[PDB]
């Protein structure tokens, strides 16, 4: 999965 803009 491409890392999202928030955790």
């Amino acid at each position, epitope marked *: 999965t*491409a*890392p*999202p*803009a*928030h955790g």
Partner: antibody
Amino acid sequence: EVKLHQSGGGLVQPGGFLKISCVVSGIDFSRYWMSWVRRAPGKGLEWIGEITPDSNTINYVPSLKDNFGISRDNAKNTLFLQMTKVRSEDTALYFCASYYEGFAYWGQGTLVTVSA
Amino acid sequence: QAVVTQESALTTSPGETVTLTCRSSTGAVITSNYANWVQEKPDHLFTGLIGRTYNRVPGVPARFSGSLIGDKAALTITGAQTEDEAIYFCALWYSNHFVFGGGTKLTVLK
């Protein structure tokens, strides 16, 4: 090579309904979070919502929860934005965006005009 | 109804360093606000610069860096170029949604 191609939009009357599409190519769509964002005249960037690759999490700014619906079809590499019971203040340029660390990839934008 | 506050406008010039800040109405900006910075150039041309306070989007020049100075998130440009004249938007995460600030019009004096 990475392309977020938007289509739809245009003119809609107050109270009306409109669905925007964003077809992704150049990346494995099914592993990217996707987001919808808008830019209205005289107003800053506004984040509408986002959706996980598996569609099991769909997040919205609460004030737009009732007039926008986000979905995706990974088999057709397409992200959707349903505009529901549109208001005059929904006139804006709408952009799909894909997450990679931040707002990494961007569509060309879709103009939606709400006028009676 | 969280509000994200940025400087309305700042002026730098080519080769200089400038810092932009982003403040939360709910209190100190912390890691779980996952500050994102997005650049708007003319023609409604948007570019993501920083995600999760510190991380460069791939391809972003090294002259862009994020930070947490005090209670605020910050974007620093070291060695500004004419191409950096833009509106810079900061978005803060509030548990289940992003809120963008009003944006900083950055002038790189021509």
